[PDB]
Amino acid sequence: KLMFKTEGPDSD
Amino acid sequence: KLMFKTEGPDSD
Amino acid sequence: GAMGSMERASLIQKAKLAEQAERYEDMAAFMKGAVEKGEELSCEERNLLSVAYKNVVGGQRAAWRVLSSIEQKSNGPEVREYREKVETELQGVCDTVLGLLDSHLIKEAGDAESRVFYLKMKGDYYRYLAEVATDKKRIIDSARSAYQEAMDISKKEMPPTNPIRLGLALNFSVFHYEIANSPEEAISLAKTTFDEAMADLHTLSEDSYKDSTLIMQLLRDNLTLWT
Amino acid sequence: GAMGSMERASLIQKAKLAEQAERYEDMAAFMKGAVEKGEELSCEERNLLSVAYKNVVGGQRAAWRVLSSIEQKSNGPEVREYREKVETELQGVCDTVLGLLDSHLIKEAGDAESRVFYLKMKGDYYRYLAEVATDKKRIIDSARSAYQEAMDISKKEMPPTNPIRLGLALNFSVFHYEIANSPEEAISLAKTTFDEAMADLHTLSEDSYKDSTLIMQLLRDNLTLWT
Numbered sequence: 001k002l003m004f005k006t007e008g009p010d011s012d
Numbered sequence: 013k014l015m016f017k018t019e020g021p022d023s024d
Numbered sequence: 025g026a027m028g029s030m031e032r033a034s035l036i037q038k039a040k041l042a043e044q045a046e047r048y049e050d051m052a053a054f055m056k057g058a059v060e061k062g063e064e065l066s067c068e069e070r071n072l073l074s075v076a077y078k079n080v081v082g083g084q085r086a087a088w089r090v091l092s093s094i095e096q097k098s099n100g101p102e103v104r105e106y107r108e109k110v111e112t113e114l115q116g117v118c119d120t121v122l123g124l125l126d127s128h129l130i131k132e133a134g135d136a137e138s139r140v141f142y143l144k145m146k147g148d149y150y151r152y153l154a155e156v157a158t159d160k161k162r163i164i165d166s167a168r169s170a171y172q173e174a175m176d177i178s179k180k181e182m183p184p185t186n187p188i189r190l191g192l193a194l195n196f197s198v199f200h201y202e203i204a205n206s207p208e209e210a211i212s213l214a215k216t217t218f219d220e221a222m223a224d225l226h227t228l229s230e231d232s233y234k235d236s237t238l239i240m241q242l243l244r245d246n247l248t249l250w251t
Numbered sequence: 252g253a254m255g256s257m258e259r260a261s262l263i264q265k266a267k268l269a270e271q272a273e274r275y276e277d278m279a280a281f282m283k284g285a286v287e288k289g290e291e292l293s294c295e296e297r298n299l300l301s302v303a304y305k306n307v308v309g310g311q312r313a314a315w316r317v318l319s320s321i322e323q324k325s326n327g328p329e330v331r332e333y334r335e336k337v338e339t340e341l342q343g344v345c346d347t348v349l350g351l352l353d354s355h356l357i358k359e360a361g362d363a364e365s366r367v368f369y370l371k372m373k374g375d376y377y378r379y380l381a382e383v384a385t386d387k388k389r390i391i392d393s394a395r396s397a398y399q400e401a402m403d404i405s406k407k408e409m410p411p412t413n414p415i416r417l418g419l420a421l422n423f424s425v426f427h428y429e430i431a432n433s434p435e436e437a438i439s440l441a442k443t444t445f446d447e448a449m450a451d452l453h454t455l456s457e458d459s460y461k462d463s464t465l466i467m468q469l470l471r472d473n474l475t476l477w478t
C-alpha cells in the first residue's frame with residue numbers, strides 16, 4: 001500500500 | 013564495536 | 025503491572041536507554057509503567073510514550089499489510105490465521121494505548137499542549153484500529169471525534185505553527201483521505217494548515233522555524249501525491 | 252509448547268509468511284514448533300530455522316552492545332539492570348537454540364550438509380554466549396569444540412567451495428580473531444579458506460559460483476580489516 005506521511009516515527 | 017563479517021543475516 | 029515495583033524515575037531512564045538500543049517493546053512497557061504511577065507526564069515523557077508505541081504499532085501495521093496483501097492474492101487457512109494473529113496483537117496494542125489515555129491521561133490534561141497531544145493520540149490509535157476493521161463505522165467515528173476535539177482546542181489555544189497542532193492536522197488530513205474516503209476534505213485541511221503556518225513562520229526563532237517547517241514539508245509531500 | 256496443536260506443514264508455511272512480514276520472533280517460534288515435531292529438517296527448513304534465530308539474536312546483540320557501551324562510559328543501578336535484562340533474554344534465546352540442537356537435531360543428522368550446518372550453529376550460539384560472558388573459558392571451549400568438529404567433517408566430506416563449509420570457516424575465523432584472541436589463527440584460516448575455494452571455482456555452475464563467491468567476499472572483507 002502507498003502510505004501517506006503521518007506524524008512521528010515512520011516505523012511501518 | 014567494529015563487528016566483522018559473519019555468515020547469514022547482518023541482523024545486529 | 026510488572027513495572028509496579030520500579031521507581032517512576034527509573035522507568036523513564038530505562039525508556040530512554042531502550043530507545044537508544046532500538047528496544048521499542050521494552051520502551052513501551054517502561055512508559056506504560058511510568059503512566060500507571062498516576063502522575064501527569066511532562067512534554068518529554070509524553071514524547072517518549074508516543075515514540076515507543078508508534079514504533080511498536082508501526083512494525084505490526086507493516087506486518088499486517090504484507091499478510092493482508094498475500095491473503096487478498098490467495099483469494100488452506102494458514103494465511104488468514106496468521107494475518108488474524110498479527111491483527112489481534114495490533115488491536116491489543118491499540119486498546120492498551122487507548123486504555124492509558126482513558127485511565128486517566130486525558131481527564132487530567134488541562135493544558136492545551138498536553139490535552140491536544142493525548143487527543144491526537146486517541147484519534148491515531150482509533151485510526152490504526154480502523155485500518156484493520158471490517159464495528160468499523162463506530163471505530164471511524166471515535167477517531168473523527170477525538171481528532172475534531174483536538175482540532176477545536178488547537179485552533180483556540182495554539183499558534184498555527186505549533187508542531188503539535190501541525191502534526192494533528194497532518195494526521196487528521198490522512199484520516200480524511202483514506203479512512204473517511206473524503207479526499208477533498210483531506211486536501212482542504214492540508215492546504216489551509218500549510219498556508220496558515222507559512223504566514224506565522226516570521227514570528228519564530230531559528231530552532232522553532234526548523235521544527236514547524238519539518239512538519240509543513242510532510243503536508244506538502246501529501247498534497248503532491250493527492251493533487 | 253504453544254505450537255504442539257499446529258500441523259508441521261502449517262508451522263513451516265507460517266515461518267515463511269513471518270519472514271515476509273519481518274516478524275522474526277514469530278518465525279523462530281514457528282520453526283521451534285516445527286523442530287519439536289521430532290522429524291529431521293530439510294535444507295530449506297534448516298535455513299528457515301537459522302534465519303529466524305539469527306535475526307532475533309542479532310537484535311539482542313545490537314541492543315546489548317549499545318547498553319554495555321553506555322554502562323562502560325558510566326564507569327544509579329538502572330544501566331546495569333537494563334543491560335542485565337537484555338543479556339538474560341539473549342542468553343535465553345542462545346540456550347533455546349542450543350537445546351533444539353542437543354534435543355535432538357545433531358544426534359539425528361548423519362549427512363554432512365545437515366551435520367556441519369547444526370554444528371556450525373552450535374559454535375555460533377556458544378560464540379554469542381561468549382560475547383556477553385564474564386564460566387567464560389568453558390563457554391569459549393564449547394564454541395571451539397563445535398566449530399572444530401564441523402570443520403573436520405567439512406574438510407573430509409565437502410568441496411572447498413561448499414557454501415556451508417565457507418560460512419563455517421568465516422565464522423570460525425571470527426571466533427579466533429575476537430573470542431579466542433588468536434588473530435593470527437583467524438587470518439591463516441580466512442586466507443587458506445579463500446585460496447582453496449578460489450582454486451575449486453572452475454568446477455561450478457554460474458549459480459553455484461555466485462553462492463560461493465558471495466561468502467568468499469566476506470572472508471576478503473575481514474582479511475582487509477585484519478591486515
Ligand SMILES: N=C(N)c1ccc(-c2ccccc2)s1
Binds near residue numbers: 043067068072075
Ligand atoms: N524521542 C525522544 N526521546 C524525544 C522527543 C521529544 C523530546 C523532548 C525533549 C525535551 C522537551 C520536550 C520534548 S525527547
Ligand SMILES: N=C(N)c1ccc(-c2ccccc2)s1
Binds near residue numbers: 270295299302
Ligand atoms: N530465507 C530463506 N527463506 C531461505 C534460505 C535458503 C533456502 C533454501 C531453499 C531451497 C533449498 C535450500 C535452501 S530458503
Ligand SMILES: [Ca+2]
Binds near residue numbers: 105106109265
Ligand atoms: Ca497463527
Ligand SMILES: [Ca+2]
Binds near residue numbers: 038332333336
Ligand atoms: Ca530492567
Ligand SMILES: [Mg+2]
Binds near residue numbers: 010011012
Ligand atoms: Mg509510514
Ligand SMILES: [Mg+2]
Binds near residue numbers: 015016018022023024
Ligand atoms: Mg553483524
Ligand SMILES: [Mg+2]
Binds near residue numbers: 108111112
Ligand atoms: Mg480479526
Ligand SMILES: [Mg+2]
Binds near residue numbers: 335338339
Ligand atoms: Mg548476567
